[PDB]
Amino acid sequence: STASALGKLQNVVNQNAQALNTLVKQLSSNFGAISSVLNDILSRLDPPE
Amino acid sequence: DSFVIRGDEVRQIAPGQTGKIADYNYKLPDDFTGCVIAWNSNNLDSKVG
Incomplete structure (x- = not known):
């Protein structure tokens, strides 16, 4: 009946x-660029920048 | 390398440049190393006719 006794294993999981x-979430950030998706960056502007 | 070009379009002679001659007549590599020297030749390469 009583739960919350196996705290350590649940904590690890x-x-x-x-x-x-x-x-996997950190993949959707600009990091100061103008877009978070690389394909649009490639297909939108000129290679030097 | 040597040639003769209009005075206005000398801006196109640089790496990562887009234009008429830069795309259809003469292209420089992006990592080009070297020098470019241009000088007016109106008094010799231009005719009154």
Whole structure:
């Protein structure tokens, strides 16, 4: 009946899942560029910039 | 390399340049190393007729 007794294993699983989630999330940032998607960058403007 | 061009279009002689001669007559590599020297020849390459 009582839950929340296996705190450590649940903590480990949650930490792993959260790390993976934020890693794949970080793919949608501009980082100071003008677009977060590379194909549009290639097909929108001139190669030197 | 040597040639004769209009005075206005000398801007097109540079790496990563777009234009008429830069795309249809003479193209420079993006990582070009060297020098370019241009000088007017109106008194010799131009005729009254």
